[PDB]
Amino acid sequence: CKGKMQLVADLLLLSSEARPVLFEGPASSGAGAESFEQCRDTIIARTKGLSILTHDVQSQLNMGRFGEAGDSLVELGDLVVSLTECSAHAAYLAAVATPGAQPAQPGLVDRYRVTRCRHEVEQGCAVLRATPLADMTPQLLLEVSQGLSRNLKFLTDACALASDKSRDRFSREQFKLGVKCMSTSASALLACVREVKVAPSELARSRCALFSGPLVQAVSALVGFATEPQFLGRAAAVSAEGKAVQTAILGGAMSVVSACVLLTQCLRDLAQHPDGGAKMSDHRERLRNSACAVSEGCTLLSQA
Amino acid sequence: HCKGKMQLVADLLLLSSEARPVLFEGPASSGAGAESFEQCRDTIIARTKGLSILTHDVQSQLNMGRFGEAGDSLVELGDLVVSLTECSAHAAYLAAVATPGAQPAQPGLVDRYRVTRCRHEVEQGCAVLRATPLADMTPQLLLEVSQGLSRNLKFLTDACALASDKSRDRFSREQFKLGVKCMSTSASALLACVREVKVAPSELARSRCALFSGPLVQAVSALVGFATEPQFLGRAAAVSAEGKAVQTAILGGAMSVVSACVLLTQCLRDLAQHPDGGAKMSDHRERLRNSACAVSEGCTLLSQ
DSSP: OOHHHHHHHHHHHHHHHHSTTSSSSOOOOOSSSOOHHHHHHHHHHHHHHHHHHHHHHHHHHHHTOHHHHHHHHHHHHHHHHHHHHHHHHHHHHHHHTSTTOBOOBOOSSOHHHHHHHHHHHHHHHHHHHHSOTTTOOHHHHHHHHHHHHHHHHHHHHHHHHHHHHOOSHHHHHHHHHHHHHHHHHHHHHHHHHHHHHHSOOHHHHHHHHHTHHHHHHHHHHHHHHHTOGGGSOBOOBOOHHHHHHHHHHHHHHHHHHHHHHHHHHHHHHTSSSTTTOSOHHHHHHHHHHHHHHHHHHHHHHHOO | OTTHHHHHHHHHHHHHHHHSTTSSSSSOOOOSSSOOHHHHHHHHHHHHHHHHHHHHHHHHHHHHTOHHHHHHHHHHHHHHHHHHHHHHHHHHHHHHHTSTTOBOOBOOSSOHHHHHHHHHHHHHHHHHHHHSOTTTSOHHHHHHHHHHHHHHHHHHHHHHHHHHHHOOSHHHHHHHHHHHHHHHHHHHHHHHHHHHHHHSOOHHHHHHHHHTTHHHHHHHHHHHHHHTOGGGSOBOOBOOHHHHHHHHHHHHHHHHHHHHHHHHHHHHHHTSSOSTTOSOHHHHHHHHHHHHHHHHHHHHHHHO
16 A cells, blocks of 8 residues: 555656656747746746645655655646646746747647647556556546546547648548547447456456557557648747746756656655665755755746 | 569469468368358369469460569469468368268357458558558559458458347447447548558658558457457367368368469579579479479369
8 A cells, every 4th residue: 555655656757757848849838828927926836835745745754644645746746747837838938028039830739738648548558458457446447548538538629620720631631530540449448448347357358458559559640640740830939038038947947847856756765664764864855955946946937 | 673573473472372371270160151062172173273274374474584474373373372272171171071970160250261361461551551662652552552451441341240240249249340440440541641642642641651550450450359359259160080180181282282382482483583594493393293293182182
């Protein structure tokens, strides 16, 4: 049951390390219709939440309340994710607010989001593959099936929009065909997930693994097609000052993420021999690291 | 180039005729749909005659240097050997079950041999779409690939429809349908790309065709994999030792024929480098021998 904490202090780590796909590259709006000031306020809120959750998870671990610590981590991960996205967006807005800037131009789809969705679909199917039978509980399968259901819902909407925005016949129809393929694959798999749920057996499980391939491939093909170079639009064109302004904020946000990562590993570290815990300083140092990182983050938002 | 066009055939033929030996190893099942032993034997006689003819034809046509003709002769030889193989297998089954204490085979929801072949051919087609460089992707090759895939997919669809009907399980009954839907949508998605790379050739379109190949292969693999689950497979015939002997004989003879024609293919393949200076016309002549004698064995083990 303490294992359930190593789990989180890992899926969380990867969840928050994946998001640094916004911290390296060009300048694009990392969000949907918000202004810089509001965004910075959001970041402030997140950092507050971060202080709170840092303390909470710390004390909850040091109490021996692992089940709570886990959820606290989950929330911390989600919070760091949000903070990262907002940081990226604020960096972009600050960048384009600069004198001679030209704004970015949207692709047919949001690359970052669909990339995330592909990653999540692959993760879900991986979970269906790597889970042993008796461990495939009716709740786990429902969670996986629900996660696949959102991801597919988002991809479907995105590709619908992309189809609409397309002014070429082939692309317009290809998006639709790809969507149909994706949906049928999904249905086929989810049937198997329901079957292995109601009538568990090794056959049904291997079946669930069998019908995972078509969905992963479908989504990979659709996303691959959706991100063809001519569909990608354009990153913003900004002066050196803009890029500096953006680099700063991205730096701070990266500081936060890295600090929280080190904290996560430190949480995972003591989850073997807690009573002994010869490494009590390492854990405590990351509260500080995170706090200072948050300070940098706040520093580069008020100045630029 | 035109002798170049012959490596292709003297290879796809070999694999086409070596793949069909999926009827030459295993248990005893009807390898055809509703024919009697005598008629089957007659068919085999006809095939062997045709085989003698085509043996000569391809031999002389090569030794004349008329390669384009030799190629087509090979193709027809391949098709003929395939037919002979199927008939031989069926005759072996019929002879086996004609034995005193035999119990006949019982059909699975689908014909394993055919769907296996179809999966193999879909994979082959998609492989061809992947490994062909642009401009070698001629408007005829794409049409050929497309029609092949369409032919295999039509068969798979009909078979799985029948399987859905014959199913006595709700889940299986529905799963066949879902799998078919998935297969068809994937197919459509891919064939669209095949049409695009044909009308508007480019590297993008080509890589696209390769991109949209995965979902179809996986769809077919999942559907075929599911269709051949152990509880769907039915039963092989239960025959005495004499029956099995009787079958072993015929399968042996037919295997002799196939192996001989394989070696002949290789001998034809051998001389397509230095025809003017090829000391091994004897290797080539010997396979006439092997094939003829093999045909004799085949006929021998058919009379009893």
